[PDB]
Symmetry: D2
Subunit: 227 residues, 4 copies
């Protein structure tokens, strides 16, 4: 059974200031937190600079001056489904995330194959075959601890096998993931995952992620770049 | 000027489930997130075990079975004031936190000195002296880039100099901090900081941090231990 | 083509003391480094305790007192071949290692399947099938950027596909890997990898890794435990 | 008592290839390791490109193509003395190092103060004063657990108090430390520490660290930059 990518933003930072701090801002949550952490460094809760007085303007300055460490206080959790095991192998290479993965048939078809009906059929026949071989092996094994027979038979399962993964990281880790994977260089499936995560995070925190440019490439696949 | 420790919980995880997941729980936020991440691993959104069906019971099981990695999805940010530079040096040794520290007179008196009026006066006279020496040096320097004269004169400032720090970490990092520092072994000031952070987190997430026992020791200082 | 696990220790720490430190020890390299770092903490280069004067005795004490952070200064690099992609996915979940993996036919047969000639043939026929499907797809694609056709066709490759990986970490990270994976709980393939890494490290640093007990289980698979 | 900065390279990576790999290179140790890890990724042990056949040329290419992750396999340990507690507080902010610090009178004089005999005397009189106050407090305390009286009296010790620290990290972590701290922006004392660490590492691994430019500034303080 063929499944498509699904990215859902399931967690985010909720911010509340200490009451005894003379400071307020034009935004709530993660982006207010980031501003708070910045002002906490220099004791600028009274906003002495008229240029960087607003949240959006404040966060934009943090960026240029390269104080991206401030981004580490804000957090986001994605629940990702419809991602292959091979793309998940790439995703877990990013070591500042925290993961909870589905303990290892639904399958993920590469879009270049999905776009050609005749290749798709050929692909799915190869998937059925893998699954037939898995069952034929698992039954041969269990015949003659039984977690051991399944973990052995799994060896036959394809890269395309769907995984599901909870992934948490701070905004700095997200920006780095997206910067590496959403660029045109990158593997197609992980690029799509990154663009989709970005899209969710551009909604959640428009200024932190605003500098990223989503373009549709000619092949209809999307990409993102930043200065 | 003498200041006391202040710990304020300024950020926490807000959780919202994907609509298309047949699962609900008896709690909101961080602890619901942790449960979600656990069920996501094994696809137990339908709750097949009557023992671990509730959130509190579910999280308690996670603990015993040692799946503490699930705790990494939940986050907490403290704003800490009234903490000495020496205690902050100990705090930043914990490398899975993210920090934003006040860029380096308010001072922190060790409680053993604070409890004796005559020692306290002796301590504060030593603090005034440090501050007199700081100014007398900074003025000698600036006389004959001027960020360089202050950073040189600072060399004379005591360990007791107050710092202020924004500190973020996931629940696993918090549990580890508290486990190491809230134990009787630990330095007094960092122990107090840990107990206070724990107290805030026991309010925020009673089951995750419930297993920690706060005792008052004989000297009136508090401690925390866990099995 | 079937390949077996190969673990090779390709890098280790070389230690040389500063000449101006009045200290010498009965061992060279990594374990001398660890002792040096310990004595550097407390200024015990002159060895005041007759019990913990020797390296082996010194390192054994570090262990009991739980100063395992001293182990972080010593490093080891393994080159691992004959490891499946699924076991490599488990290996890279350990986030304090550094990895360089073979950029993705040689295959790894699970030992439970390898031990039965008839299952093995069935397994290898499933491997040939995967490979036939890979080529038949890659040729269909390239017919009608060409890094994109291979990365799409790979989707069909099994978990068993051999990977090769350079893996570096400090002794603390190694001890943790081995502690989690070499225990009887663990997946068979990753357990074998861990035992083998341990065996190499027990040769390289006998006292650091000496407390780990390698037993052969009844099924002829090996295991390791520690107090 | 006044002490000066001392940086000593006490550990480095020793490399030995697996015998069964048809590959040799024109260098030993850390830089051969880095090349090995690169070739392991792409199976280029036979050197197909005449441009990047030598180690120095190979490592230089790794740099431009931004595969700096290869640098993580190589390790270096410094023993640093004559570093103030305030500079050590900055140093430990770099979270991918491993540290063993002297458990907290020798003092470190800021060079801007050291260069003026009259300021130096003023500084050292402030240091004697801090030390007199420390003893006068510790004796008042111990009069009326005794690790608690010293840790309280320490509160009075200045930033300038000498620390000693064992610091380990991989070449990537070193490059990042040096990149942030050796630049003209940076605090003077931590800049000097970074330049000195660089100087040691330029000897140890000339190609990995060769791109860093050490200039003497007008004030006689040194700096380092890289493209
Ligand atoms: C052109 C290119 C080709 C590559 N080819 C391969 C390949 O064939 N095989 C392969 O295995 N890898 C390859 N890599 C590297 C691999 O893609 C990355 O290592 C992986 O995606 C993890 O990302 P990261 O290294 O940025 O670190 P992450 O784990 O995402 O961490 C983010 C940042 O934190 C820092 N960091 C985290 N941990 C450490 C640490 N232990 N030491 C120092 N700094 C740390 C680094 O600054 C890093 O940039 C390649 C990279 C590039 C650019
Ligand atoms: C009795 C005792 C005495 C000590 N004395 C001294 C002393 O005199 N001087 C001194 O400098 N330190 C000393 N330490 C160690 C020091 O207290 C800790 O290193 C510091 O508090 C950081 O905590 P952590 O090591 O648990 O790691 P954290 O940085 O808090 O990380 C938490 C966990 O993540 C893991 N981790 C993080 N980074 C790495 C990594 N790079 N490699 C492997 N694992 C990692 C470890 O599992 C660690 O437990 C002592 C420790 C003990 C128990
Ligand atoms: C019974 C059991 C079942 C599990 N089931 C699943 C499952 O179904 N799916 C799944 O995805 N995972 C599962 N896990 C967890 C998974 O095996 C581990 O997360 C993975 O092996 C990485 O190991 P580690 O978590 O010890 O951390 P490593 O990355 O190996 O790091 C070593 C140590 O450093 C510290 N550390 C490193 N990074 C951080 C951080 N960001 N925050 C706080 N501390 C950190 C921790 O102390 C950690 O112990 C399970 C674990 C157990 C015990
Ligand atoms: C202009 C400027 C002003 C600053 N002012 C202040 C200040 O007033 N107060 C203050 O406290 N700090 C300040 N900082 C930040 C502080 O200097 C750094 O946070 C500190 O030196 C640690 O360095 P690092 O952040 O590069 O990370 P390191 O800990 O050195 O790690 C190296 C790299 O690994 C990655 N990394 C490691 N851990 C994580 C993580 N948890 N999440 C995501 N990525 C990670 C990052 O890519 C990082 O660049 C300032 C920074 C700049 C540029």
């Amino acid at each position: 059974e063929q499944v498509k990518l699904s990215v859902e933003l399931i967690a985010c930072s909720s911010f509340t200031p200490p009451a005894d701090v003379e400071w307020s801002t034009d935004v709530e949550g993660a982006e207010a937190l980031v501003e708070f952490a910045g002002r906490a460094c220099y004791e600028t809760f009274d906003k002495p600079n008229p240029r960087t007085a607003s949240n959006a303007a404040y966060l934009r300055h943090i960026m240029e001056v390269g104080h991206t460490a401030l981004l580490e206080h804000a957090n986001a959790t994605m629940y990702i489904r419809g991602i292959s095991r091979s793309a998940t192998h790439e995703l877990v290479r990013h070591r500042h995330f925290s993961f909870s993965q589905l303990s290892q048939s639904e399958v993920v078809v590469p879009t270049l194959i999905d776009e050609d009906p005749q290749l798709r059929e050929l692909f799915m026949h190869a998937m059925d075959e893998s699954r037939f071989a898995f069952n034929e092996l698992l039954n041969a094994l269990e015949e003659k601890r039984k977690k051991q027979a399944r973990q052995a038979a799994r060896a036959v399962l394809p890269n395309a096998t769907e995984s599901r993964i909870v992934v948490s990281g701070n905004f700095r880790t997200w920006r780095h993931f997206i910067g590496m994977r959403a660029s045109e260089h990158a593997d197609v499936e992980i690029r799509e995952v990154a663009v989709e995560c970005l899209r969710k995070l551009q909604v959640a925190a428009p200024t932190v992620f605003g500098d990223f440019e989503i373009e549709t490439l000619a092949d209809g696949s999307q990409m993102a770049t930043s200065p």
